[PDB]
Amino acid sequence: AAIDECLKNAKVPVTARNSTEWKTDASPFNDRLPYTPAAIAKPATVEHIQAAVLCAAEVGVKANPKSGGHSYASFGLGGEDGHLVVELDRMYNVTLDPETHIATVQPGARLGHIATVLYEEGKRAFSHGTCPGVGVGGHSLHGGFGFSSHSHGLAVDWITSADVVLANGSLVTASETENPDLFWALRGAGSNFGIVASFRFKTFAAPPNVTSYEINLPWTNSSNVVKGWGALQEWLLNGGMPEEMNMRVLGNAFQTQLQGLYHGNASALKTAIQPLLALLDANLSSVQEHDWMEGFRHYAYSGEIDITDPGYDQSETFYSKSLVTSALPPDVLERVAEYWIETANKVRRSWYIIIDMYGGPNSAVTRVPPGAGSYAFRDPERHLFLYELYDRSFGPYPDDGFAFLDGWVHAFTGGLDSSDWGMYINYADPGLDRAEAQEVYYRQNLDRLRRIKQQLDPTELFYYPQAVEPAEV
Numbered sequence: 001a002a003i004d005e006c007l008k009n010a011k012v013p014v015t016a017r018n019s020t021e022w023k024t025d026a027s028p029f030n031d032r033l034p035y036t037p038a039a040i041a042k043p044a045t046v047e048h049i050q051a052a053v054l055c056a057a058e059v060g061v062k063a064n065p066k067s068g069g070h071s072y073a074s075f076g077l078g079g080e081d082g083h084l085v086v087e088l089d090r091m092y093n094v095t096l097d098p099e100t101h102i103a104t105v106q107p108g109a110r111l112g113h114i115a116t117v118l119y120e121e122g123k124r125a126f127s128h129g130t131c132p133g134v135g136v137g138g139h140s141l142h143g144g145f146g147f148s149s150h151s152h153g154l155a156v157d158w159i160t161s162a163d164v165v166l167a168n169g170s171l172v173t174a175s176e177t178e179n180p181d182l183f184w185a186l187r188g189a190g191s192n193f194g195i196v197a198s199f200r201f202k203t204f205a206a207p208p209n210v211t212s213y214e215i216n217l218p219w220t221n222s223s224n225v226v227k228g229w230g231a232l233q234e235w236l237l238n239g240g241m242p243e244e245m246n247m248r249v250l251g252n253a254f255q256t257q258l259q260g261l262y263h264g265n266a267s268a269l270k271t272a273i274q275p276l277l278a279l280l281d282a283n284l285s286s287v288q289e290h291d292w293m294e295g296f297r298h299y300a301y302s303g304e305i306d307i308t309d310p311g312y313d314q315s316e317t318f319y320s321k322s323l324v325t326s327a328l329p330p331d332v333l334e335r336v337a338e339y340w341i342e343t344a345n346k347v348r349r350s351w352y353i354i355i356d357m358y359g360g361p362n363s364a365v366t367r368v369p370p371g372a373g374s375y376a377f378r379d380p381e382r383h384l385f386l387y388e389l390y391d392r393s394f395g396p397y398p399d400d401g402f403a404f405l406d407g408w409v410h411a412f413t414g415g416l417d418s419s420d421w422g423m424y425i426n427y428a429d430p431g432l433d434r435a436e437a438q439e440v441y442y443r444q445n446l447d448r449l450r451r452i453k454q455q456l457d458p459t460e461l462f463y464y465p466q467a468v469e470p471a472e473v
């Protein structure tokens with residue numbers, strides 16, 4: 001087709017439709033949501049990225065970058081058939097400056113590779129998600145929360161600059177002192193404004209020791225959930241969680257527990273966690289001290305950590321939702337708990353809920369000023385919890401299945417004003433229509449995002465079904 005011929009004349013490497021690598025390059029993380037690209041550009045340099053983008057523009061097809069391919073909605077494939085996919089997985093180099101400790105990171109680098117390089121070379125790190133296979137591209141541009149986030153913020157917070165290919169093939173570098181509107185827009189909604197061709201990340205010195213731990217919670221009836229969660233949110237909201245502690249509730253039908261990573265040794269953790277244990281009347285378990293990389297492997301849930309192989313093909317079949325909420329009124333706790341016990345526990349599929357200890361007075365995430373970036377959820381009291389709701393089938397996902405997580409989210413949102421909840425596009429939920437998605441993902445920052453979108457991508461070359469709409473002018 002015309003896109004193929006354009007790329008060929010432009011000397012852009014591609015994955016041919018009839019090649020073995022098509023299947024690999026085109027394959028979603030979420031097997032529920034395969035899409036067939038118009039074509040797959042396989043850039044080795046920013047020049048190839050520029051050329052691919054221009055080809056899409058000239059030919060008249062949409063284009064999207066695919067970094068790690070982990071979009072829960074397969075938005076790196078375009079979220080529908082027929083886009084040019086700019087597959088970035090051949091560009092995964094990580095360079096660490098020994099002086100400045102600034103890492104130059106190619107946009108197809110996955111988190112496990114980045115973490116390995118930074119640690120092996122200079123015992124450095126930045127704050128990012130768990131999951132070695134996740135691409136830095138989608139992850140860092142929309143937030144990126146992990147077991148260092150209470151201590152050190154989101155992945156997006158470690159970006160110091162980015163080189164970007166715009167919709168018309170122009171190159172720009174975005175930073176606090178250059179293209180500051182774009183730098184703002186990138187840092188929360190970056191899928192909408194161009195293809196980031198290179199990141200620079202600041203780093204922190206990796207702590208010599210981190211301690212993972214668990215606290216099993218007796219959340220087996222509604223009253224226990226309500227009282228437990230009620231205590232937990234009050235503790236968090238009142239500054240109970242120290243900066244070194246990073247923690248979440250993981251719940252499934254068969255067990256509920258807090259899971260933490262404490263940036264310090266086991267004796268320091270025990271002392272730090274005691275007030276919570278007394279409050280919940282609970283016990284610590286599985287206390288394990290680690291070096292930095294072993295801490296990362298602990299929550300990685302993956303054999304391979306330093307992943308760079310283009311054959312990468314981990315996939316699951318699932319539906320997922322997210323939320324960001326304030327503290328929950330007890331009426332909402334009750335509805336959410338009743339849903340958990342009476343509905344979620346009975347669902348005959350592998351589901352889980354994660355409630356991240358996200359905000360509160362000690363969180364690095366919510367110490368970032370409200371004007372710093374387009375990422376919306378920075379208020380230490382209003383943005384207290386981040387949630388992942390995940391509903392996985394082994395075999396085809398049932399078409400009536402969505403009502404399960406949909407109903408659960410309704411139990412929260414029925415009792416919260418729209419100023420007290422949002423959603424998180426790193427757990428992209430294609431159940432939301434375009435209008436709702438923009439609103440819930442970006443909330444108070446949507447209007448400025450729409451203005452920058454009209455300025456940088458007025459033709460919506462980088463369209464996907466939950467992309468920011470250009471402001472009308």
Ligand SMILES: *Cc1cc2c(nc3c(=O)[nH]c(=O)nc-3n2C[C@H](O)[C@H](O)[C@H](O)COP(=O)(O)OP(=O)(O)OC[C@H]2O[C@@H](n3cnc4c(N)ncnc43)[C@H](O)[C@@H]2O)c(*)c1C
Pocket residue numbers: 029064065066067068069070071072074075076077088107128129130131133134135136137138139141142143144145146190191192194195196197425426427464
């Ligand atoms: C599969 C998976 C996802 C996880 C895991 N753990 C996470 C965690 O511990 N914390 C989190 O906050 N998130 C976690 N996630 C979710 C991932 O954070 C999101 O799914 C990321 O958005 C995925 O990033 P990536 O793998 O790069 O996904 P893509 O599908 O390639 O892209 C998503 C989105 O971003 C755009 N995009 C990619 N690359 C670029 C560049 N270079 N420039 C602009 N825009 C880019 C894509 O077009 C698409 O829109 C654990 C697991 C197992």
Ligand SMILES: *[C@@H]1O[C@H](CO)[C@@H](O[C@@H]2O[C@H](CO)[C@@H](O)[C@H](O)[C@H]2NC(C)=O)[C@H](O)[C@H]1NC(C)=O
Pocket residue numbers: 044045090091092093
């Ligand atoms: C990432 O880094 C490696 C080197 O660390 C680059 O490898 C070079 O590749 C070129 C051809 O592409 C060869 O001529 C050199 O011999 C390679 N050097 C080494 C030391 O192996 C690689 O090009 C870089 N990849 C990207 C995508 O930028």
Ligand SMILES: *[C@@H]1O[C@H](CO)[C@@H](O[C@@H]2O[C@H](CO)[C@@H](O)[C@H](O)[C@H]2NC(C)=O)[C@H](O)[C@H]1NC(C)=O
Pocket residue numbers: 166168170172179455456457
């Ligand atoms: C490519 O797009 C960029 C961004 O939309 C254009 O650069 C802008 O040009 C306008 C009009 O001159 C200026 O007001 C903006 O300040 C520019 N923005 C930036 C970030 O530089 C650029 O003109 C476009 N190039 C072409 C050939 O159309």
Ligand SMILES: *[C@@H]1O[C@H](CO)[C@@H](O)[C@H](O)[C@H]1NC(C)=O
Pocket residue numbers: 207208209289290291292
């Ligand atoms: C602490 O970290 C060091 C490396 O920094 C590691 O070698 C050691 O085993 C760790 N200690 C424990 C108890 O895990």
Ligand SMILES: *[C@@H]1O[C@H](CO)[C@@H](O)[C@H](O)[C@H]1NC(C)=O
Pocket residue numbers: 218220221223224
């Ligand atoms: C819930 O379970 C606890 C035991 O964990 C029990 O004491 C309590 O009475 C139960 N509450 C209800 C309402 O069933």
Ligand SMILES: *[C@@H]1O[C@H](CO)[C@@H](O)[C@H](O)[C@H]1NC(C)=O
Pocket residue numbers: 264265266267268
């Ligand atoms: C644990 O860390 C503290 C610092 O918070 C330090 O004083 C103490 O020596 C450490 N304990 C061990 C066994 O390394």
Ligand SMILES: O[C@@H]1[C@@H](O)[C@@H](O)OC[C@H]1O
Pocket residue numbers: 253254341345346
């Ligand atoms: O509610 C129950 C759930 O919690 C789990 O134990 O599996 C059986 C279900 O009936």
Ligand SMILES: O[C@@H]1[C@@H](O)[C@H](O)OC[C@H]1O
Pocket residue numbers: 130131299301354388
């Ligand atoms: O463990 C992972 C969790 O950290 C992330 O939030 O969502 C995906 C899970 O696999």
Ligand SMILES: O[C@@H]1[C@@H](O)[C@H](O)OC[C@H]1O
Pocket residue numbers: 151152153154157158202364368
């Ligand atoms: O460098 C910053 C760090 O000091 C803070 O803790 O988290 C946000 C980062 O941008």
Ligand SMILES: O[C@@H]1[C@@H](O)[C@H](O)OC[C@H]1O
Pocket residue numbers: 402429430431432
């Ligand atoms: O029906 C919707 C489905 O098409 C989408 O993939 O996931 C959300 C569902 O509500």
